[PDB]
């Protein structure tokens, strides 16, 4: 017998656990991709051509 074929041993995920895991993973990915690639304020530039100095 091939006892690990698709038709055998399917365990559905409870809806509550499915929702909780989905929310957790989506939140984590969104938060990380945001705070890493979007909230990057050290890349600051100032546009002021009058701050040049030539003797």
């Amino acid at each position: 017998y091939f006892t690990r074929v698709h038709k055998y041993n399917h365990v559905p995920v409870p809806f509550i656990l499915n929702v909780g895991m989905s929310i957790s993973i989506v939140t984590s990915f969104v938060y990380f991709t945001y705070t890493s690639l979007w909230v990057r304020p050290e890349y600051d530039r100032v546009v002021d051509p009058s701050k040049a100095y030539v003797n």
């Binding site: 365990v11 656990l17 909780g20 957790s24 984590s28 938060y31 990380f32 705070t35 990057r40 304020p41």
Partner: protein, 51 residues
């Protein structure tokens, strides 16, 4: 021994594996948020008093 708790595949997956992963996901999100606040000091504004 005679006291060992033996579960079938379905029972084990349903009553052990899935709740474990659920708790792990909760820990993941909570730790991400609390660690980011712990270091930078702000939840969404990067370093505190610097920007």
């Amino acid at each position: 021994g005679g006291d060992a708790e033996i579960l079938s595949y379905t029972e084990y997956v349903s009553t052990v594996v899935y709740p474990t992963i659920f708790y792990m996901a909760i820990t993941f999100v909570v730790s991400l948020f609390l660690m980011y606040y712990y270091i930078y000091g702000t939840f969404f504004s990067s370093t505190r008093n610097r920007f």
